[PDB]
Ligand binder design. Sequence first.
Ligand SMILES: Nc1nc2c(ncn2[C@@H]2O[C@H](COP(=O)(O)OP(=O)(O)O)[C@@H](O)[C@H]2O)c(=O)[nH]1
Ligand SMILES: Nc1nc2c(ncn2[C@@H]2O[C@H](COP(=O)(O)OP(=O)(O)O)[C@@H](O)[C@H]2O)c(=O)[nH]1
Lengths: 335, 335
Amino acid sequence: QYEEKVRPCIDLIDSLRALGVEQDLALPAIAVIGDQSSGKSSVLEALSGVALPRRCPLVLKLKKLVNEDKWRGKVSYQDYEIEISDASEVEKEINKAQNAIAGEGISHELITLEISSRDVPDLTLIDLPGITRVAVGNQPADIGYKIKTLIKKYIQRQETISLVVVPSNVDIATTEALSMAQEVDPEGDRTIGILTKPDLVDKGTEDKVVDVVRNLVFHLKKGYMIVKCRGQQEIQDQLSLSEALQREKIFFENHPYFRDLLEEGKATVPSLAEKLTSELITHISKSLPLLENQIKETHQRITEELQKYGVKRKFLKERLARLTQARRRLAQFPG
Amino acid sequence: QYEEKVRPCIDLIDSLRALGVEQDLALPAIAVIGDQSSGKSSVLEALSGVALPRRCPLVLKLKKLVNEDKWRGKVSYQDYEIEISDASEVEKEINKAQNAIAGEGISHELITLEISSRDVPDLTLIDLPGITRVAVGNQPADIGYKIKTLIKKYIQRQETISLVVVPSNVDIATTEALSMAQEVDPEGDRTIGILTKPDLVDKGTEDKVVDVVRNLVFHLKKGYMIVKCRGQQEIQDQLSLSEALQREKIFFENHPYFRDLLEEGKATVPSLAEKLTSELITHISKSLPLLENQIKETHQRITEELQKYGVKRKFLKERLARLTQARRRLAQFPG
Ligand SMILES: Nc1nc2c(ncn2[C@@H]2O[C@H](COP(=O)(O)OP(=O)(O)O)[C@@H](O)[C@H]2O)c(=O)[nH]1
Ligand SMILES: Nc1nc2c(ncn2[C@@H]2O[C@H](COP(=O)(O)OP(=O)(O)O)[C@@H](O)[C@H]2O)c(=O)[nH]1
């Protein structure tokens, strides 16, 4: 059992997404973006409390158990739906997901990871493959372009909040992820910054980081958070994610510069978790009253096009049947 | 007095550049490019042995004294030419240069720094302003674009070797500087990589760095070098550049991973210095035999255009007078 005061809104959006209506209907979403090796999957590991594999969208559904506190997991992709038993079984199951989902560049097909735990927020996130600028190894030359196209698909929509992951040890102005966010959101009204790797910041440089997190260099309405996740040695030693939280807490409390950020409510995964639930709820709340008319408008313009060209047909009869299903599912809200 | 076996070639190119002929005549060059805060000016500080200020092209002319060993410096920009007395006087003089040269974005006007010292290589470099992707602060929104245009002006030319500065603590595939190099040089035949900040690499991650420097991730004909320059605390303590070399030496000799790179001749500023002189000489050598005909071809096509439109006139009579001066100066070679 969950908090039935937060779940209905989150579950509603998840159900609409799972209907395959997002091609024609923008749905409230938090898209996670970052340059390759910015620590994006680390943040997800910390938020979900589970290890993820060493590309295509990943829908992460986190559900906070208020009740009996039995860890449950589930992975869905295509026709597969597989119940996970242990938390350390998860990495294995996504590895498998990522296998079936990728035959030969980037895939637009969704893998959905659902986790019910005492230690997870009530939160849905869409994680998007890391941005590269140079093509390395045996991957195609247009892989960067394709990654960008997949990212734009989400982030160009007004209904998407961009969650930008940036390492503290790189200049904020050089981030491609943030650059893309500024492109679609010049005012910086639907972008949140997560800084990582605060332990790797050059000594004498920490004040620059503080300036960023305090919203003084590149301004974001919704602000910034700073986090410390497992370093490579800690991953190499298979350090538990529970201990990683404990270590993060100690790191910020003892930090000569970052303690201020902690006291200002701008540090640690637990505080990030709460901030992301608030942001998600506020953002779904914004779309709630409009959904019924947007569905109606779009069902109207697709019926127009149906009449124009046909009256490819059976494909448009499948789009409309999905939109009808969206209207029905919305009519059930909040139950 | 200098080694008159290396100076004639380097001085020849410098004299042609100073004639203002590079608009119509590609000249052998090493352009230094990097993302903002990649440690680019640090590398230049180490190579030149002098401190540089905290934007427009900077032509760095380094001349190794074989003779009496009296440190000499000179800064030229527009009509100014100012003789520098001390090595620590330099930062001040470029600050002044950068003032006169920038009235209100990026300037294409050249500031030329000439240094004659026992401790400098025989080397000319064109340093280009750092790349940004996000516009911060009170700077114009198209500043990134303008920086890129200035960089492309140099690096699109076959006669330009791109010297790409990349920090070891960022994923090689995410570098915009390297991305631009790959764009104009897909084969990777006229690009050199300099990795910086090897001390800031995450523990358990050093092997990735080694892989890069050994030319195994993104392949460059001319290869990679790795260097350690002053960190911010050391700059804050005004650590001498002589001691910085000593420290770099000790750092690589004692490093559990990077010692191999040192023994493979791929580390330290002194080894970089020698590699850059070789590369410059080889590259000027490549253009030497062609220069006379290229000048003639271009003097021919500008006389064609002179005839076409005119026969704006006095501007083309000034381009041709510069090309005539280039042909004369070449006719003096090697004296
Ligand atoms: N020291 C340190 N290392 C981190 C931190 N966050 C992430 N990393 C490391 O940075 C690397 C890149 O992180 P990852 O999550 O794989 O990046 P992604 O490619 O953006 O998903 C990994 O080796 C992590 O161990 C941090 O807060 N501190
Ligand atoms: N620890 C460490 N810091 C470095 C190294 N090289 C450069 N830095 C620092 O990184 C910052 C950016 O360097 P800078 O040369 O100003 O970058 P630019 O903007 O590319 O010219 C400066 O604060 C330097 O002190 C290095 O090898 N080690």
